């Protein structure tokens, strides 16, 4: 009644390797440490593909969830209990 299913799947994706695209086209693949009700994602050990194609290694990242276009989660969470 209060919290939705996709934020439960986002909380279920913590510890896993998620790849989050942001509003400025930058793709961040790495270990999602923590995520909140708003989609503020503290992630770590991040491989970053910018818009040009350059890849950087940013070891501790906190993305503001407003700017997140989407996150690609592991398909393990296709069997997560809140997706039933």
């Amino acid at each position: 009644m209060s919290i939705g299913v996709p934020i439960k799947v986002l909380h279920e994706a913590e510890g896993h390797i998620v790849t989050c695209e942001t509003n400025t086209g930058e793709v961040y693949r790495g270990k999602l440490i923590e995520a909140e009700d708003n989609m503020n994602c503290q992630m770590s050990n991040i491989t970053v593909t910018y818009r040009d194609g350059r890849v950087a290694q940013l070891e501790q990242v906190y993305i503001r969830g407003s700017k997140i276009r989407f996150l690609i989660l592991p398909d393990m969470l296709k069997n997560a209990p809140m997706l039933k």
Binding site: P6, R69, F70
Partner: protein, 73 residues
């Protein structure tokens, strides 16, 4: 809000705000229209299909959902 509980597990096409297409199995949604889509293939234009997996699409960037296919077995 049963108008999209009618559409769960249907293979849906989600046109986004940049113009990208998300053809994925519509698993879940919430009040902010954040979608959970599984086995989601991105379609962009020059045509190419880019498999992603379990996409948590934030509701800010979703324009329009439409069904591509019936739910699988």
């Amino acid at each position: 809000s049963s108008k999209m509980l009618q559409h769960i597990d249907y293979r849906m096409r989600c046109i986004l705000q940049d113009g990208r297409i998300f053809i994925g199995t519509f698993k879940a949604f919430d009040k902010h229209m954040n979608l959970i889509l599984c086995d989601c293939d991105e379609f962009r234009k020059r045509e190419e299909k880019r498999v992603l997996g379990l996409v948590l699409l934030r509701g800010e960037n979703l324009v329009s959902m439409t069904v591509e296919g019936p739910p699988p077995k």
